[PDB]
Structures are given as C-alpha cells and as structure tokens.
Amino acid sequence: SSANNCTFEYVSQPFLMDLEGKQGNFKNLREFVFKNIDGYFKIYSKHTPINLVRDLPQGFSALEPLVDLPIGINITRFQTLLALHRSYLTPGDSSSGW
Amino acid sequence: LFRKSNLKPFERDISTEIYQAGSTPCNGVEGFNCYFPLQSYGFQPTNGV
C-alpha cells in the first residue's frame, strides 16, 4: 500500500505452486530462526514431515542457515503474512469473510 | 548530528525529525537551542588541507 523507497533486492524465482488446500492431519512443518550479528541478518531454515494433527510434535531435530543479508537497520518488530480468499460462494468479501 | 545514543555497527540512520537539544519538543522547528538534526559539510572548493 505504499511507495517502494527501497535499495535492497534479493530474489530467486523458480516458480511452482502446490498449495493443495486440505483439512487433513498436518504432515508439513517449516521452521525459521531470525537473528542478526554485526548487522548481518542471518535466517536459518528447516522443514520436516510429522504425523500429529493438533498439537506440536515433540522430538529432536537440527536447523541450518539458509540466507544472510547486510540489512544495516535497527529491528524491533515483526509480523507474519497470511493469504486467504474464497470463491464467489462466500458473501463476506476478502477483508470481510473467508 | 548528535544522535541521542550511540550506534550499532554498520547501520544507517534514516531520520528527518529534529534532535531535541535543550529539552525542546519541536515540530521540525526551532526554539531554545533546537538545532537541525542534519548537517552539510561546507567544503568550499579548493579549501585548506
């Protein structure tokens, strides 16, 4: 909703989508750890399949680094991004209903 | 100019608001020692070393 006013860009575009909207027991778990040293924002990433449906599966795993960025900016807040819109069937609009 | 604290290494201070000197809430304006936050070097061409 605002202007670009940006300087940094790092994008890799192998394009495919396999969302497969389902209500079944969860078998896919992503995990991302975000931190920074000296300004070098480091983001470690991992993914794994599980079996449980509702709670968090308790076992043990490991995480590894996936990306680094020289952001050089003070960071205090963060908010996640969700995306969901329904067909014509839902009378509640995108912002309204889903 | 004269950021109220010290900096974290390798960071950019992108600010416009006027730094409060002399305890002055300023709307980007002057007052009792309310000096502009930015400063431009007065490098007169062919100056002293």
Experimental method: cryo-EM
Is the distance from CB of A45 to CB of A66 less than 8 angstroms?
yes
Is the distance from CB of A72 to CB of B11 less than 8 angstroms?
yes
Which is it for strands A29-37 and A40-48: parallel, antiparallel or unpaired?
antiparallel
What dihedral do alpha carbons B25, B28, B33, B38 form, nearest 10°? 130
* Quoted resolution (Å): 4.2
Which chain A residue lies closest to B14 (C-alpha atoms)? A73
B10–A72 CB contact, under 8 Å:
yes
Which is it for strands A40-48 and A64-70: parallel, antiparallel or unpaired?
antiparallel
Cα–Cα distance for residue pair A87/A80, rounded to 1 Å: 24
Structure tokens at A36: 């920074």
Is the distance from CB of A50 to CB of A57 less than 8 angstroms?
yes
Residues with Cβ within 8 Å of residue A92, at least 6 apart in sequence: A86, A98
Cα–Cα distance for residue pair B6/B26, rounded to 1 Å: 22
Residues with Cβ within 8 Å of residue A29, at least 6 apart in sequence: A47, A48, A49, A50, A57
Is the distance from CB of A41 to CB of A68 less than 8 angstroms?
yes
Using beta carbons and an 8 Å cutoff, which residues of B are at the interface with A? 8-12
